[PDB]
Sequence to fold (96 residues):
Amino acid sequence: CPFDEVFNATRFASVYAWNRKRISNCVADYSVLYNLAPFFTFKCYGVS
Amino acid sequence: CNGVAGFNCYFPLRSYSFRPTYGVGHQPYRVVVLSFELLHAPATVCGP
Fold:
């Protein structure tokens, strides 16, 4: 399911108009969330 | 990870940071566990 267009997006949204998306009925591959760049912050609360 | 922090290189310890202000279900608790072994032996220990 598409995470490319929500990350490789040309135009983003303002802080007061923070952009919403809902994802359901898909398979999520959270490994290809690695080459966004050298050095980025990845913190998650609740699960390992 | 050559012994340095980074992505996929996480230090396997975490902290609590207890403050008097959190909710009733988050304060520290003190736990002690007593283990016995009821078998055949010289019976070193028992009560009054």
Notes: The interface with chain A takes residues 7 of chain B (CB under 8 Å). The two ends of chain B are 59 Å apart (CA to CA). Chain B is about 0% helix and 0% strand.
